[PDB]
């Protein structure tokens, strides 16, 4: 759910968005005590999306 949030954030206000970085870190990190594999799937997918977005402009 924060995935699309930072996806639209980076293209709506056009910043490096370390806040978006922290959001995605929280998104991925809360997987230690849970084995919710599809959540891991969408987490790595939004990781790829943010990786591409970071590759896009400056970061």
């Amino acid at each position: 759910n924060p995935a699309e949030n930072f996806r639209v954030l980076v293209k709506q206000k056009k910043a490096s968005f370390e806040e978006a970085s922290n959001q995605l870190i929280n998104h991925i990190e809360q997987f230690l005590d849970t084995n919710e594999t599809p959540y891991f799937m969408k987490s790595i997918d939004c990781i790829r999306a943010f990786r591409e977005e970071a590759i896009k402009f400056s970061e």
Partner: protein, 1120 residues
């Protein structure tokens, strides 16, 4: 004694019963009891009012006679004028006298006294027949004057008592015994039961028709009471053998005093004519009873003895019924002529001949219809049909009451009885004579809408009622056959035209008229499909077919209940292009079926099955193929279906179950749906394999990523989330399905109190008491297994169930995992968390009650605490709590080893589809328990006294012990004689939620008692008390000015409680009442301090060393 008040009557009834008891003794025996008894006779028995007085006088004279018999020997009543026989004679005479009050009072008085009167044998042996005949004649007189008289109820109750005792006791009556002769049976002999039985039988045929009817019913029920013959019609035949023809006048004295007076009344008296009519009706109803009881044949009165009064009455109907409503052609005579009861008698005659015809046709088969030919015309078929179409055609039939409202059922019965008879054809002709079945359809096209004619509606209702009666008689085509097909469009076309052109106005009268027309059309078969077509009317005003459904939805539901699936299938095929009205009519179907449960809901079950097969014929919906509104509508429809049908068929694999269930999953698979709407659809999951749970996870993942507070409160998405989670909570609470339990726990047990876990745990509290014990055991095992933060799951989940689980499933589930916990009892965070949970579950386990291995487990936990990063302290706390639990039972001694409206509301709802520290808590409980089990004691309070009295001890430990002793001051009250010593020095220089909190709490606890102990035994106690006084008086202030004042009264209390060891510095007090001496108010607080000083009786001021002792009070006047 009988007044509308509590206290007056309440004190009066003991007085009246007391004087009743007294005024019957041998002393108070005669000449003063006479007034009391005669007035108790004339008080309520004769009066126009005060039913309360009637019942009171009744049972008080009952008790008077009872007590008189009780305390006075029978010889004394017999010799005295005050005797039971005299009372009975008085009652009989009063009933005889021609006034309503006397008879009603006597009858009700007997009704009251009967309970004790029936227990006397000599009196009834000597006095029953007299009472019987008196009550017969009194009830006949009550018939004579007015039936509405209240005397009739008392008389029928009295004769009910009479028949009750005659059946209860008959052996004495069965034999001929020389009892006192009543007025009846003028010959005197040894009275027998059969004597008065046949005396009553000979008197049958009285103008009082219902009096005679009750008499003959009692006769019939007393036939078996005879000592000889039983009660068949065969004994009636034996009576009939010799009396083959005498019954014509004996059992039927009427018909005109036999035949003649009936003929006499015709030329010449209107009241006499009514007397003839009612006596004739009495004879007729006697005939009807005889032929309906099957105790006699129709031919017995139709060839053995022939009553010509029957044919005389038939000719009279040809002379007086429906054509002579003002005069009977006697020419000798509305209210001035009293046509009201004249029409009432006419209607009574009509109804009586109605039962006669019905019984003749039914009780006597068509073999006796030749006796129906005795009329030779049965002219009634020409007039009684008018009775069916117009009550005002039997005379007037004005009043419109339960008699005419009851007429239609017997009319339908007569119609059926004649239908099995041949004459129905002629009546059918008469039917077609009376109406064409279509001459009215043009006359109802006169625009009956609001302002219009009203007689048109009148005979519309008349013909509607007549056709309903015919339909109840199983005849519809006797008046209107098929026009071209079974579909009788003559009514449906009128229905559609009227319902469309009513507004292309409205009225409730025309509404119910149209409803009657609708049911008349429903009587015609085949109209269902044409109506289905009419409902599918795209003609917009909104569409017209749905409008017609809205006007008469209930009638359409009633009609379509009869159709199983034909119209259902057609709507299903027409659902591919029609959505709104088809959904509405399906909802109407479901609501009507669900409403129908007094007889059965099985019609609803069959309808659900049929729509289950039809389900796959409307595939344009319930996918990404229909609007979201359509999907919501079908979800509501299927939810209604699920709540209607039982969750044992189509809950598991049952025929068409998967085709919707998979669809349901597909419906859940529709991600385009709103998550709120998804939760609404989920709410029906209690009605229910891996695919289900897997799609559940794949949906819920996209809802709550990591947090609940990431969405601000009040955010529309946030409210959506809280609505969805509460839907899940309630559905799971209804279902108790373990996998959903695990899902909810794992989605919730992420952060402490963020998903609003109060409802979570509370729903667990309910569901702990719900479900089978084995189900609870399996659920607990499932959650325990999914256990194997990580600890947050068990911490938030298990103790909720354990504290409230059934104490039987507790034993089963634990005994399943005894060794499973013992073994595991013996990076490292996982170990300590698991042991956390193990202690927190074993303590609750032990809390219930006490194999043999358990003895070991104690030590296995004790060492767990005795070891000497915060997780280690939490571990020690958990281990000690578990040890406390196991101590709760073992070591109980010392040495602890240190409605209709509700139904309507439910139907409406169904149709709407809308329904400060805490780680020490068990310590106080253990203290209370050990106090309940049982200065100095090896209860460790000496140990705690040493542990706390020392100044050198960590402050947190002192706070803990202080909180415990505050919560447990009561137990060691007869030890406070020592407990004042530590607390004082603990309070002294005391230094965490806040110092003053615990300071005020501990001082209040200490000062809760004063006579128990005082700080004066050792110099240290009072010096520390004075020091604490100094500390508080330095610390005493609040801007609140209320808690500040509260501390002021606290000081006032504590100074006056001792007054023995207290000291006044007078220096700090001096500067407090002096201060800086400003214009403003700062030092006045010190002034208030002096109030405490002078709340005391202590000297106003003492120079402890002398501040100045002269102008020490100069500051006071300066401040003043």
């Amino acid at each position: 004694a009988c007044d509308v008040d509590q206290v007056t009557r309440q004190l009066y009834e003991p007085l009246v019963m007391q004087l009743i008891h007294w005024f019957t003794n041998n002393k108070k025996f005669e000449s003063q009891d006479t007034v009391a008894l005669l007035e108790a006779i004339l008080d309520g028995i004769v009066d126009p009012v005060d039913s309360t007085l009637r019942d009171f006088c009744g049972r008080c004279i009952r008790e008077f006679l009872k007590w008189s018999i009780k305390q006075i020997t029978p010889q004394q009543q017999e010799k005295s004028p005050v005797n039971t026989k005299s009372l009975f004679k008085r009652l009989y005479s009063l009933a005889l006298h021609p006034n309503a009050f006397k008879r009603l009072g006597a009858s009700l008085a007997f009704n009251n006294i009967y309970r004790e009167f029936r227990e006397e044998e000599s009196l009834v042996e000597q006095f029953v027949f007299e009472a019987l005949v008196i009550y017969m004649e009194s009830l006949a007189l009550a018939h004579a004057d007015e039936k509405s008289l209240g005397t009739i109820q008392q008389c029928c109750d009295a004769i009910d008592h009479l028949c009750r005792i005659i059946e209860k006791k008959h052996v004495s009556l069965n034999k001929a015994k020389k009892r006192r002769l009543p007025r009846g049976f003028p010959p005197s002999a040894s009275l027998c039961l059969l004597d008065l039985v046949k005396w009553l039988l000979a008197h049958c045929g009285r103008p009082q028709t219902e009096c005679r009817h009750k008499s003959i019913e009692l006769f019939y029920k007393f036939v078996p009471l005879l000592p000889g013959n039983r009660s068949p019609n065969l004994w009636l035949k034996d009576v009939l053998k010799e009396e083959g023809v005498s019954f014509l006048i004996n059992t039927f004295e009427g018909g005109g005093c036999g035949q003649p007076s009936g003929i006499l009344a015709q030329p010449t008296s209107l009241q006499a004519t009514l007397c003839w009519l009612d006596l004739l009706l009495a004879a007729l109803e006697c005939y009807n009873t005889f032929i309906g009881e099957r105790t006699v044949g129709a031919l017995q009165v139709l060839g053995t003895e022939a009553q010509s009064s029957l044919l005389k009455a038939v000719a009279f109907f040809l002379e007086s019924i429906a054509m002579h409503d003002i005069i009977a052609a006697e020419k000798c005579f509305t209210s001035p002529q009293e046509g009201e009861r004249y029409n009432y008698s006419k209607c009574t005659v009509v109804v009586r001949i109605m039962e006669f015809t019905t019984t003749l046709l039914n009780t006597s088969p068509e073999g006796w219809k030749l006796l129906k030919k005795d009329l030779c015309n049965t002219h009634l078929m020409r007039v009684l049909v008018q009775t069916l179409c117009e009550p005002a055609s039997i005379g007037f039939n004005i009043g419109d009451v339960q008699v005419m409202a009851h007429l239609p059922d017997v009319c339908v019965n007569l119609m059926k009885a004649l239908k099995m008879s041949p004459y129905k054809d002629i009546l059918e002709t008469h039917l077609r004579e009376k109406i064409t079945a279509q001459s009215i359809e043009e006359l109802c096209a006169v625009n009956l809408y609001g302002p219009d004619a009203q007689v048109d509606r009148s005979r519309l209702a008349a013909v509607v009622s007549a056709c309903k009666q015919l339909h109840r008689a199983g005849l519809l085509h006797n008046i209107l056959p098929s026009q071209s097909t079974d579909l009788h469009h003559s009514v449906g076309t009128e229905l559609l035209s009227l319902v469309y052109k009513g507004i292309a106005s409205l009225d409730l009268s025309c509404k119910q008229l149209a409803s009657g027309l609708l049911e008349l059309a429903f009587a015609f078969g085949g109209l269902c499909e044409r109506l289905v077509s009419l409902l599918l009317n795209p003609a917009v005003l909104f569409s017209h077919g749905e409008y017609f459904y809205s006007l008469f939805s209930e009638t359409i539901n009633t009609e379509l209940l009869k159709n199983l699936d034909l119209a259902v299938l057609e709507l299903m095929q027409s659902s591919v292009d029609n959505t709104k009205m088809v959904s509405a009519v399906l909802n109407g179907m479901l609501d009507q079926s669900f409403r129908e449960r007094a007889n059965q809901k099985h019609q609803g079950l069959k309808l659900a099955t049929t729509i289950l097969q039809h389900w796959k014929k409307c595939d344009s919906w319930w996918a990404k193929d229909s609007p979201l509104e359509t999907k919501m509508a079908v979800l509501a429809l299927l939810a209604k279906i699920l709540q209607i049908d039982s969750s044992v068929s189509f809950n598991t694999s049952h025929g068409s179950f998967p085709e919707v269930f998979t669809t349901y999953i597909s419906l859940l698979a529709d991600t385009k749906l709103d998550l709120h709407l998804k939760g609404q659809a989920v709410t029906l999951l209690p009605f229910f394999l891996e695919e289900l749970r897997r799609v559940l996870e794949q949906l819920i993942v996209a809802h709550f990523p990591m947090q609940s507070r990431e969405f601000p409160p009040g955010t529309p998405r946030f409210n959506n989330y809280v609505d969805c989670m509460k839907k899940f909570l309630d559905a799971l609470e209804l279902s108790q399905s373990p996998m959903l339990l695990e899902l909810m726990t794992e989605v919730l047990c992420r952060e402490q109190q963020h998903v609003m876990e109060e409802l979570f745990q509370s729903s667990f509290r309910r569901i702990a008491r719900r479900g089978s014990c084995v189900t609870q055991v399996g659920l607990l095992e499932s959650v325990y297994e999914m256990f194997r933060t990580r600890q947050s799951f068990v911490d938030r989940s298990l103790l909720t169930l354990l504290w409230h689980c059934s104490l039987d499933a507790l034993r089963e589930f634990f005994s399943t995992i005894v060794v499973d916990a013992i073994d595991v009892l013996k990076t490292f965070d996982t170990q300590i968390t698991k042991k956390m949970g193990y202690y927190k579950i074993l303590d609750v386990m032990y809390s219930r009650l006490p194999n043999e291995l358990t003895k070991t487990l104690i030590k296995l936990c004790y060492d767990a605490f005795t070891e000497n990063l915060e997780r280690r302290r939490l571990y020690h706390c958990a281990a000690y709590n578990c040890a406390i639990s196991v101590i709760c039972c073992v070591f109980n001694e010392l040495k602890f080893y240190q409605s209709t409206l509700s139904e309507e509301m439910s139907q409406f709802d169904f149709s709407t589809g809308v329904q400060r520290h805490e780680c020490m808590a068990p310590l106080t409980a253990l203290v209370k328990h050990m106090h309940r089990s049982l200065r100095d004691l090896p209860s460790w309070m000496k140990f705690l006294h040493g542990k706390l009295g020392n100044p050198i001890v960590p402050l947190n430990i002192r706070l803990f012990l202080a909180k415990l002793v505050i919560n447990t001051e009561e137990v060691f009250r007869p030890y406070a004689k020592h407990w004042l010593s530590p607390l004082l020095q603990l309070a002294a220089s005391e230094n965490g939620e806040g110092i003053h909190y615990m300071v005020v709490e501990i001082v209040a606890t200490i000062l809760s008692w004063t006579g128990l102990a005082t700080p004066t035994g050792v110099p240290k106690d009072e010096v520390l008390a004075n020091r604490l006084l100094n500390f508080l008086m330095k610390h005493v202030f609040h801007p609140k000015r209320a808690v500040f004042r509260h501390n002021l009264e606290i000081i006032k209390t504590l100074v006056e409680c001792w007054k023995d060891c207290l000291s006044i510095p007078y220096r700090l007090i001096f500067e407090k009442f002096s201060g800086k001496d400003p214009n403003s108010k700062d030092n006045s607080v010190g002034i208030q301090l002096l109030g405490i000083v002078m709340a005391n009786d202590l000297p106003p001021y003492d120079p402890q060393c002398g501040i100045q002792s002269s102008e020490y009070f100069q500051a006071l006047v300066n401040n003043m």
